[PDB]
Amino acid sequence: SSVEKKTLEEFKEKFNYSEEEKKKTLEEIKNGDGIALIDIEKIGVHTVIAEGSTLDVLENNIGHFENTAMPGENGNFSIAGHRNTINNEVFRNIDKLQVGDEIKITTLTDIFQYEINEIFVTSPSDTDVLNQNLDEKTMTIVTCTNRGKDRYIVKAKLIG
Numbered sequence: 309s310s311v312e313k314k315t316l317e318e319f320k321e322k323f324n325y326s327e328e329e330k331k332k333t334l335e336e337i338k339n340g341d342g343i344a345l346i347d348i349e350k351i352g353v354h355t356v357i358a359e360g361s362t363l364d365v366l367e368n369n370i371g372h373f374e375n376t377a378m379p380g381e382n383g384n385f386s387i388a389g390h391r392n393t394i395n396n397e398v399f400r401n402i403d404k405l406q407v408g409d410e411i412k413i414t415t416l417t418d419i420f421q422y423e424i425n426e427i428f429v430t431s432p433s434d435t436d437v438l439n440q441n442l443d444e445k446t447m448t449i450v451t452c453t454n455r456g457k458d459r460y461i462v463k464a465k466l467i468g
Contacts, residue, residue, distance in 0.1 A: 311368035312398075316356035317341045322416055330416045340365050343372055344379050345414040346387075351401040357387060357413075366391035373438055376448075379413040380420040380466065385447040393456025402451055402462065410420060411447065411464050422447050422464035429458050437461050438468035 319342025322333060337343060341393030347354050358369035364373040370389050377383030389399040405424060413420045430437060437448055437459070445466035453460035 309368070312355060313417070314390050315340070315358055315369055316345075318342060319345065319356050325416070327417075333416070340369070343415070345412075346370065347414070348405070348408075348409070348413040349412075350409045351404055353398055355398055361388040363391055368397070370396060373450075375437055375440075377440060377445075379447070380418055380445065382442040382445055383461075384438065384444075385413070386438050387447070387449050388450040389449055395451045395453055399449070399451050403453075405462060410467075411449075413447070420466060421468040423467045424462055424464040426461070426463040428461050429453055430461055431448065432457075432459055435457065437463075 322330065324376050325333070337359050339358075339362060341359050342356045343359050344357045345355070346357055355370065358371050361371040361373045366388055370387055373386040373388060376386035379385050389396045389402070396422045405427070407424050408428065409424050411424065413422065437450060447464050449462040451460045452458070
């Protein structure tokens with residue numbers, strides 16, 4: 309969209325940074341900065357993930373929950389695809405994803421492939437979806453469902 313494209317283009321430009329420059333931007337990250345690309349072939353999602361899950365971030369971008377793992381790390385890299393009761397239109401077709409579909413996450417240094425292994429509906433107060441189990445490498449997408457009343461959760465495990 310507007311800010312989305314910008315965040316997206318600014319991040320892609322950093323692929324041409326050197327390694328210390330990349331590492332330096334790792335530290336220094338601020339809410340609203342691009343941190344990864346996300347591609348989900350099954351539903352035509354090809355965009356960027358911003359840091360943070362505040363209302364301000366989520367108005368323009370898919371956002372990374374602050375205290376969750378980063379892509380490829382032990383724990384559960386968690387992303388928010390709604391702002392209050394409104395899904396980012398980028399996830400309008402998330403209900404088409406199935407167990408076994410792939411989610412590709414590209415940081416400045418690596419391509420991580422996650423495979424969906426759990427889909428479920430829960431409440432807005434179910435904070436456990438953001439839990440960090442450091443014995444595994446997983447990711448989570450949180451959007452809304454049921455006229456904004458419930459949360460639609462997609463979880464995926466790192467495969468490559």
